[PDB]
Design a binder for this molecule. Sequence first.
Ligand SMILES: C[C@H](CCC(=O)NCCC[N+](C)(C)CCCS(=O)(=O)[O-])[C@H]1CC[C@H]2[C@@H]3[C@H](O)C[C@@H]4C[C@H](O)CC[C@]4(C)[C@H]3C[C@H](O)[C@]12C
Ligand SMILES: C[S@@+](CC[C@H](N)C(=O)[O-])C[C@H]1O[C@@H](n2cnc3c(N)ncnc32)[C@H](O)[C@@H]1O
Ligand code: SF4
Ligand code: FES
Ligand SMILES: [Cl-]
Ligand SMILES: [Cl-]
Ligand SMILES: [S]
Ligand SMILES: [S]
Length: 346
Amino acid sequence: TGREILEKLERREFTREVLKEALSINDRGFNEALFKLADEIRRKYVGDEVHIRAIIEFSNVCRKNCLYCGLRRDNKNLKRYRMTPEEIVERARLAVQFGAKTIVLQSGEDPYXMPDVISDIVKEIKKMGVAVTLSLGEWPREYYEKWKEAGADRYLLRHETANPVLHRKLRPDTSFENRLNCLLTLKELGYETGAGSMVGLPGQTIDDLVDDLLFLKEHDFDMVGIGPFIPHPDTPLANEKKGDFTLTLKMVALTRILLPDSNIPATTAMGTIVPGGREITLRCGANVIMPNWTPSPYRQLYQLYPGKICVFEKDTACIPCVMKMIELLGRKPGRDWGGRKRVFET
Ligand SMILES: C[C@H](CCC(=O)NCCC[N+](C)(C)CCCS(=O)(=O)[O-])[C@H]1CC[C@H]2[C@@H]3[C@H](O)C[C@@H]4C[C@H](O)CC[C@]4(C)[C@H]3C[C@H](O)[C@]12C
Ligand SMILES: C[S@@+](CC[C@H](N)C(=O)[O-])C[C@H]1O[C@@H](n2cnc3c(N)ncnc32)[C@H](O)[C@@H]1O
Ligand code: SF4
Ligand code: FES
Ligand SMILES: [Cl-]
Ligand SMILES: [Cl-]
Ligand SMILES: [S]
Ligand SMILES: [S]
């Protein structure tokens, strides 16, 4: 029964059986209780601070051909761009001026910068007294080492799907094995490390989602980024169904319940498939938000999926917008860099 699954979740009985049932039950009352539980756990372990990570999507050049992604190399129906290192550093500075305490640098897997240009940029941004998070994809261990030495604090490398067969089909250049090795390497080098998956991928099952939850729990990641699959018309998956918002929200809720002291964003994809989706997600276990800080004319060209929010807004709109969001939610902005604050328990 729903009540019994909740009781088992409250007792930390995180068995594969309990998780599958949580994700399988479609009862409104159960879902609402699950969301309330995650919301409460969030409040108790990580408080009311919502940490703002200003994201600069500095290049849409990619060497990989992931079947879901609008930046995949086979997509010829996309103007490619690269911000200069000077543009990136000064764009970060403007975010810092606007109060950002973390700068996230995200890109396609664009060889041009790797590794030295990134290292240079990271060094300049670290001078500003903020955290630096990288989200640049899979690279050799030596690049990750150089970036850590340059002062990067965190690395986001969503695991996408913990089903290796699905993973290899959707990401034909690589493998789940590679992805995991990258994540373990990032952990070994001392990064705060972020994983996470998409929900509603073509061919992905509820059991797969359970496996994603158990994977996250096993590796105790510092951040977990979860969003629905959103089909992109210039990709092989154009005609596939989008991920379900409620199911994805349950995955966020259960991630909070499983990893109570983790950092969990309300992802842009959540706000894209449902108006006000991020705000809902922040009330169901999330404690991080990532306003778009990519400038025009480039912001509109970073089209991982269609309809992306923030694209029509002015260059500087998104930080103020999320500060308003945080206040209207009755929440507080992050005071510090919002690094993981581990609560050791049993
Ligand atoms: C950038 C310009 C020009 C002056 C400037 O260059 N100001 C640097 C400030 C640096 N900070 C104090 C934010 C660093 C905090 C990091 S610290 O480590 O100290 O915690 C200044 C002038 C007025 C400032 C806005 C208003 O105030 C209202 C609002 C307050 C929020 O709060 C942050 C958002 C917002 C929109 C502000 C953003 C920005 O700021 C503005 C535009
Ligand atoms: C666009 S990549 C950029 C960073 C780096 N290239 C990488 O792959 O990790 C960032 C994330 O976007 C998400 N993403 C890509 N295409 C998506 C889609 N169609 N719908 C939802 N999320 C998508 C993936 O989960 C991916 O980890
Ligand atoms: S998900 Fe990352 S690696 Fe894959 S095509 Fe998109 S930008 Fe490139
Ligand atoms: S950050 Fe909320 S719409 Fe851009
Ligand atoms: Cl971060
Ligand atoms: Cl996203
Ligand atoms: S925005
Ligand atoms: S926002």
